[PDB]
Design a protein around this ligand. Structure first.
Ligand SMILES: Cn1c(-c2ccccc2)c(-c2cn(CCC(=O)Nc3ccc(-c4ccccc4)cc3)nn2)c2cc(C(=O)O)c(O)cc21
Length: 255
């Protein structure tokens, strides 16, 4: 019932970091208004994830998909990006740098991005970016990139505190922007770490609207996000991290 033909088309072969990890057609983010000279330009290995708050689970940029990444961010009107990995972890590239150096500006295809300010927080770096379309005039918007940089090289964090505080900030930022689009979340392949942050965010939100005693069904929620992007939450450790995060959150609310 869930096909992934687009990601399998020959023209999009190099647009996937891992030939085996592709987006479902029914939930894939379809990019419009691309270079007419490109055989195919409506593809990006990204899927919309909905539990009015949604997410875009995607892979880290490849050198040849950076422009597509910004087209997506602009198209979906996303104002918040959650990068969950370093650019390189254990000698493996997990995302090409898709943002300009601090105070610098770079043009990605028809998208102009200005890094206006970088700030350091505990477990993360926040980059305030200005995104606009070169051909237009009233398209500029701030995109807040939250770069979580303390995720361990191996396994998952032993304590969920850092991710929860991180997500709390992300949450506050998203709600401080009028009608911001889906929060973009990415990791190497866009399913393991990415799935973990999203599932946690989804569960925490439910607790924020139903109280510390509402029913919480992790397995159910995970299967729900998985019907929108396959493989979300790849390891036992990640699975357990989610359980720990929810509880830790509940226990924090209980004063
Ligand atoms: C896409 N991928 C991969 C990955 C899976 C297969 C091949 C390459 C990367 C890992 C991930 C998972 N393991 C532990 C599982 C294991 O015993 N075999 C193993 C796989 C790769 C390496 C490895 C790590 C660095 C360089 C070269 C090989 C070592 C052990 N190591 N690396 C991963 C982790 C996360 C995360 O949550 O942090 C993620 O979001 C995506 C991941």
């Amino acid at each position: 019932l869930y096909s992934r033909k687009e990601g399998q088309r020959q023209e999009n072969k190099n647009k996937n970091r891992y030939k085996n990890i592709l987006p479902f057609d029914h939930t894939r983010v379809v990019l419009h208004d691309g270079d007419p000279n490109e055989p195919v330009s409506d593809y990006i290995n990204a899927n919309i994830i909905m539990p009015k708050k949604s997410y875009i689970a995607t892979q880290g940029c490849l050198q040849n998909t950076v422009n597509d990444f910004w087209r997506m961010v602009f198209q979906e009107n996303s104002r918040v990006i959650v990068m969950t990995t370093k650019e390189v972890e254990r000698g493996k590239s997990k995302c090409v740098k898709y943002w300009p150096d601090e105070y610098a500006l770079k043009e990605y295809g028809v998208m102009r991005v200005r890094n206006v300010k970088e700030s350091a927080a505990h477990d993360y770096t926040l980059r305030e970016l200005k995104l606009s379309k070169v051909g237009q005039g009233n398209t500029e918007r701030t995109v807040w990139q939250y770069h979580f940089r303390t995720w361990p090289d191996h396994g998952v964090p032993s304590d969920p505190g850092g991710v929860l505080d991180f997500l709390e900030e992300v949450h506050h930022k998203q709600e401080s922007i009028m009608d911001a689009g889906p929060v973009v979340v990415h990791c190497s392949a866009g399913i393991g770490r990415t799935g973990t942050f999203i599932v946690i965010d989804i569960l925490i939100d439910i607790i924020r609207e139903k109280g510390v005693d509402c029913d919480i069904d992790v397995p159910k929620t995970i299967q729900m996000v998985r019907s929108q992007r396959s493989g979300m939450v790849q390891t036992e450790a990640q699975y357990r991290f989610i359980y720990m995060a929810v509880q830790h959150y509940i226990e924090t609310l209980q004063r």
